Design a protein around this nucleic acid. Structure first.
Lengths: 125, 206, 119, 145
RNA sequence: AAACUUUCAACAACGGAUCUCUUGGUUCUCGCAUCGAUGAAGAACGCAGCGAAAUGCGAUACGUAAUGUGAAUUGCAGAAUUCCGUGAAUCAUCGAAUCUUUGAACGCACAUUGCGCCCCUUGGUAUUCCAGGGGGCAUGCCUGUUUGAGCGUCAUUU
RNA sequence: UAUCUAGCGAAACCACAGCCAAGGGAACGGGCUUGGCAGAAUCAGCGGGGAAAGAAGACCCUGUUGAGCUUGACUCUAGUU
RNA sequence: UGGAGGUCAGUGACGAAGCCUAGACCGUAAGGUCGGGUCGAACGGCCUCUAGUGCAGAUCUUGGUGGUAGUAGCAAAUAUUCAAAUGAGAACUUUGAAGACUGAAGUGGGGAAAGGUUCCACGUCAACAGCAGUUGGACGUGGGUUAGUCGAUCCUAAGAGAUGGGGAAGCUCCGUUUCAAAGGCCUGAUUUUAUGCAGGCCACCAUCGAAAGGGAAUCCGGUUAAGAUUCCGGAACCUGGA
RNA sequence: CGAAUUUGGGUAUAGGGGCGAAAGACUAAUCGAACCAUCUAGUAGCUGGUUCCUGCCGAAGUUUCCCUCAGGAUAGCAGAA
RNA sequence: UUGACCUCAAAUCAGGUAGGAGUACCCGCUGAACUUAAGCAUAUCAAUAAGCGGAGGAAAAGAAACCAACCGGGAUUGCCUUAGUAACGGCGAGUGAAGCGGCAAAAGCUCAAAUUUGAAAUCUGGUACCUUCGGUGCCCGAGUUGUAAUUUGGAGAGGGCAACUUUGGGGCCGUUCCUUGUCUAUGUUCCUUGGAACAGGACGUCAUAGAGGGUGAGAAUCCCGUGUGGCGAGGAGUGCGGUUCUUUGUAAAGUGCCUUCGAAGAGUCGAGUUGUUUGGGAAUGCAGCUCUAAGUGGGUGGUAAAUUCCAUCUAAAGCUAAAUAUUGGCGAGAGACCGAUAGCGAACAAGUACAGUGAUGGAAAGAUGAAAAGAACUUUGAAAAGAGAGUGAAAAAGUACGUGAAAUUGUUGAAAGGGAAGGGCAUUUGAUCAGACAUGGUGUUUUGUAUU
């Protein structure tokens, strides 16, 4: 279905670009359209992704668990969220990795550069 | 061309209780004194190395091509060969299935799937959808990760959105009557492709 | 945090030189403290601060000379266009486009006429 | 070395022939690149016919005496006979041969008539006009077979 | 009868085969034309809060400036509502700079971190000595500029 | 020193192996045939045998395989005349 | 057997592939199927296509492992012993007591070449020290090499080697003073002045090449975990400089 | 065992070249021509090896020629169609 | 005495250029042998490897001193063909082009030698200015032993005779275009398995998107991305309707007829000889040496040489894009390729480690797990470690980490054994195991009566 000669469907080249990604390919676009609480209510859709968003884990063993992103571990290809941690055997509590694609954003962390994309898109909220 | 020959290995000769195969010189590495250059040698050159001037394309007589094409079109209208190919035409009212040339001008993919269900050919779709499986072997990481069956071949006289409307339809192939590849008419040298003709494509055959 | 170049570009030579000396004093002091304590990352941005001050100082000095030689040929080679040795030695646009008077009168008289075949 | 009843062969492969082996893998690639080059070239000269009007010519040898083919350029005798100048013709796509001669009337007339057929069927834009694009044809050879 | 070779619906070793994986290679094709005396390629020595290597960099040293994006980096730390902003970042760009010792390598020399000469400064109450800071000093050529040379020659005879 | 002990701990070699006599066999057998016989596990020695090990015999011959050296061998050649 | 086209809308995390199994069945056989165990992500049947497609050997290659075998052996350089301490642990480490040896062309005290941190201190014993180890040239972490006088530097030696020039297609070769237009310091001048301008002598011809050759000049006492003719305290000398 | 002595460092001579009080000695465990890479997977009538099953058929060591005699060609013998 | 000119010099004089690197392709020079010839010397390998000099994105070649012999083509290059052919070869082994034809691409030209002589009309540099890839002053110069204008063989120049065309550099809308940005579709709904749903099933949506990848297992719809289009930033671009920037002054070139002329490259061509090379054979090219021209001349016309013609071109001077080459660089897209003893030597801190004085030689080494959750805690031990415990879906995943073969080894246990063992047929003994009267006389007397 791909058409242009500038796009490669090579699995080797694709995983090479994935693992050696700069911010142009450092995941998706890391900014990406949100979940249904914001999408379905308004229609004026999109806003970029940041750290201090709130999220709901919709998949996995920690499914249906809420929290704030403690850190966006770009190197590890995961996001860390507080209150979802592993209790170690010695009582220490280490943060458990979790992939954003298995998440929905429930509450954003807004700033000017987000509201610029609203003007750029044409949103009204 | 230089694989297995990028070394200055030399035979020790007889008298040293070892095979007369060439061995790397020098010392202090582990590679030193090891066999080289041989198809039996670890790190050596393979026997009769593969070459690019191997014959890749093979010429077929033009007339034989059109003979095999006509045989493949003729086998399209044979119901027994089309079932034997496994082309799910039990719900097709007749074969050769010929549709009015409105389908030649269909625009959206929704009405390409709608047309297939209407002419009864969508059972071939569910075949291709459910026949997707991982390819067994190392072809998976040569960009051949999945395999599936073939669907119907929609043949049209004019392109008025027919190719675009059917492009994302799995297994379905479209073709202009002018070309009519044998590679699609007899996939895997097996006769009896399920072809859906538009009316104008059908009459162009004469 | 660290000084900003856009700030320093508003400061004069004496302000920047004074800003450099006490930064070198701060770095020298920090290197003494580097021995007593295991880690002190503050030394990094002080080196960055020292580098920032030197960057702008060189920029005004290089800009000062730039319009000193402005409008006349033979600027310093360090001021000239670096692009590439072969590009630098290539004929100029004016020199490569020069033609003889003989060629000029032929190009004027018979240029490549635009036409088309109809039928 | 030599054995039973076979034709005696001469396979010249005693040099390091394997270094100078060319497989034309880019047959398809070269053809695509050539069509692109023809496409872009025609655009740059957008009204012009992508070829120069070539002349008619009898093939040299006694083998090809019977055949007539497309030559290099029109003789200065032919161009003067039409009513043009070599400097002008080279600007309106009529290729001109200075080395060629005319020693034969039928080639002379067939080339002159080829010239009048060209003039009557082409329109030269004035240098200070409005450029009324006139449905360019990509082959002057196909235009005057 | 034990102790002392074989087989195990048997476990344990030794060892790293097999299987499955692949940010690598190989081959094909397509497009482009750009190293260096404005000092290249290459080498040496250094540079990070905590580096040996590897990547990057040059005493402004894992980097400065300009630009874009717009909250990281992440092994541990450490400036933090640095975060609704001339603004994070081992981020992308990248045009402006820095660019040690060298190397065609250029004051002479070089197994020396050797030895000079010229200019302007500062200091030792010094054109000459020493030290410090900053500038410089290669060949072969080319074009032009001055200064000449040669009874090579012309005017021109104190 | 060997020996015995505590620790440490190789290598050569090895188709499989390991008692004879005669026979016949590639004409000198550990094995095959016919006889003699034959009882675990072993230690120190030992030099009969294993046609023992060590090396694709260096002698000899063959190869249309060399090389060093020599000459009125064949073909040339620096130099010199 | 690897891969390819087609098909079985095939098998599969409710367990694919692989592996083990004196369990079964089938085939004369190559092999195929299946039970049981192990296992974790892919893989088969059939019609065809294709090849880097089948091993017991090649003194085959790479890797791994045996018997030999707890065997050969660990025997040159006279030689160790007692006690204590430190340590789970002492034939081997420290301390004391003995006994011995090198016996001043030393088993002593320094250096050259080479090494490169082995120096020294503190912890420390997995590996290495063919027994051992608490010890170590081992391991980990640090400290340490202080010059006007000691050397290099300077000088030339056999000899290397630019320029001038001549060969050489050319990388380059010869050549080292050759058939070259190859040279400082005093009140010259000494106020657009430092060469705007008559102030002498030449007959120099590169440069590199000695840490043992030639050379300007330093000694004593003290000092350190390790440096000292260098640090310190006294006492000198040489060179340059108004 | 006071010298044709022994010896350190510097220097010179480099492979058909050097050096040799001469042994074909020595020239980095290499010398009757060093070492390194490449030509080069050099050629070999010679030695060794050459990987699944079953079924059917089934030999030759002889002729002639060849610097032929451990090899070829040829005819014969064999298979297949 | 004082100024030149010629030649030569000098200056850390004013401003520049060359050198090295890489070198796949390209232009030259230099140059082997192994090998083949069943020996070997010519030959072949090979006008190759190695060596040296010099470039660009292409290079070289190139607008005929060509090919031809025809009813003539018409720069060069490359492909197909000519052709394993003509030809060369111990005429052995072997080697071996070109013309024509088809096509790709096609583009042309310009110096020397001429009669500016009513005007060196020409050019560098220095200073000055300006709207700085340059223009205009002015000045020193260079240059008449010749720098401009004009002509280049296809022509041209002088002179006499007509009612014929053009006065713009980079912009900006824009346009193969170069580097780039941004926006643009649809389930994570419900049950089963599982640690994880990305698997199975039910129900959907979009599709010009059912490429590819990632995410705790096989995901169009979780995301991108993909597909279509949209909106923006900067740049070598006169190709065009216009240009904020004149609307150029007594000039530029083209054509017809007629007269006179019409230069056209020298130690070069050409000849001998030598060597080498070529398919070129009484000599294909090139080079050394010797000889050395000419102007209806010269070259060529593939057998050497007189004589007569004929056909063609015009040397000894020069530029030129494209088609063509490309195992290097940069940037991309792929494959019936390999899959860690394979594929490059290197999938990894690989030209690293290590060896050698040096030239140079040159490895091995990929996988816990979804996540480190990397084993807290208790007891034995000096300790390493053990035994528990704990984490994990699995410690039959514990970093000496996926699976974990074989050799070899400790060896459930069984068995055998008087100088090997192993094997074949046969039975015995031991151990171990597959296959069988389960529903079919009654169309059915019991038996959880359509389960017989």
């Amino acid at each position: 279905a791909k058409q242009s000669l500038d796009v490669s469907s090579d699995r080797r080249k694709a995983r090479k670009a994935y693992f050696t990604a700069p911010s142009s390919q450092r995941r998706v676009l890391l900014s990406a359209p949100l979940s249904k609480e914001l999408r379905a209510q308004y229609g004026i859709k999109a806003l970029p992704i940041r750290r201090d968003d709130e999220v709901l884990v919709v998949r996995g063993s920690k499914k249906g668990q809420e929290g704030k992103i403690s850190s966006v571990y770009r190197l590890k290809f995961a996001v860390q969220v507080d209150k979802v941690t592993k209790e170690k055997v010695n009582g220490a509590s280490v943060p458990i990795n979790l992939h954003p694609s298995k998440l929905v954003i429930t509450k954003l962390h807004l700033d000017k550069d987000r509201k610029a994309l609203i003007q750029r898109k044409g949103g009204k909220l | 061309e230089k694989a297995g020959h990028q070394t200055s290995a030399e035979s020790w000769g007889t008298g040293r209780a070892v095979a007369r195969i060439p061995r790397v010189g020098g010392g202090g590495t582990g590679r030193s004194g090891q066999g080289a250059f041989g198809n039996m040698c670890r790190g050596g050159r393979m026997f009769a190395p593969t070459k690019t001037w191997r014959k890749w394309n093979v010429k077929v007589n033009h007339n034989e091509k059109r003979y095999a094409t006509a045989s493949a079109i003729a086998a399209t209208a044979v119901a027994s060969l089309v079932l034997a190919r496994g082309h799910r035409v039990e719900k097709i009212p007749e074969i050769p299935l010929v549709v009015s040339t409105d389908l030649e001008s269909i625009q959206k993919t929704k009405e390409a799937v709608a047309a297939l269900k209407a002419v009864g050919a969508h059972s071939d779709l569910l075949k291709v959808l459910k026949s997707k499986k991982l390819r067994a072997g190392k072809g998976k990481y040569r960009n051949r990760r999945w395999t599936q069956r073939r669907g119907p071949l929609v043949v049209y006289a004019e392109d008025n959105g027919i190719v675009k409307a059917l492009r994302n339809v799995p297994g379905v192939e479209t073709a202009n009557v002018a070309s009519l590849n044998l590679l699609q008419l007899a996939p895997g040298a097996h006769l009896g492709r399920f072809v859906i003709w538009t009316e104008a494509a059908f009459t162009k055959l004469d | 945090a660290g000084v900003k170049a856009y700030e320093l570009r508003t400061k004069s030579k004496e302000q920047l030189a004074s800003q450099l000396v006490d930064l070198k004093k701060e770095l020298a002091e920090l290197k003494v403290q580097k021995l007593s304590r295991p880690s002190l990352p503050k030394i990094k941005t002080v080196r960055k601060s020292i580098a920032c001050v030197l960057t702008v100082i060189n920029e005004q000095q290089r800009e000062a000379v730039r319009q000193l030689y402005k409008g006349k040929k033979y600027q310093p080679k360090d001021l000239r266009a670096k692009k590439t040795r072969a590009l630098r030695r290539a004929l100029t646009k004016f020199e490569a486009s020069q033609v003889t008077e003989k060629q000029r009168k032929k190009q004027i008289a018979f240029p490549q006429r635009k036409y088309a075949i109809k039928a | 070395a030599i054995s039973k009843n076979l034709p005696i062969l001469k396979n010249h492969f005693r040099k390091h022939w394997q270094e100078r082996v060319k497989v034309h893998f880019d047959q398809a690639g070269k053809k695509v690149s050539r069509r692109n080059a023809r496409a872009t070239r025609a655009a740059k000269i957008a009204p012009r016919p992508l070829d120069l009007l070539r002349p008619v010519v009898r093939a040299p040898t006694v083998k090809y005496n019977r055949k007539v083919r497309a030559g290099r350029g029109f003789t200065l005798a032919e161009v003067k006979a039409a009513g043009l100048t070599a400097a002008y013709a080279r600007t309106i796509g009529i290729a001109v041969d200075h080395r060629r001669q005319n020693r034969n009337q039928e080639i002379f007339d067939a080339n002159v008539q080829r010239l009048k057929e060209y003039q009557s069927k082409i329109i030269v834009f004035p240098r200070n006009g409005k450029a009324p694009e006139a449905e360019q044809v990509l082959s002057a050879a196909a235009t005057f077979p």
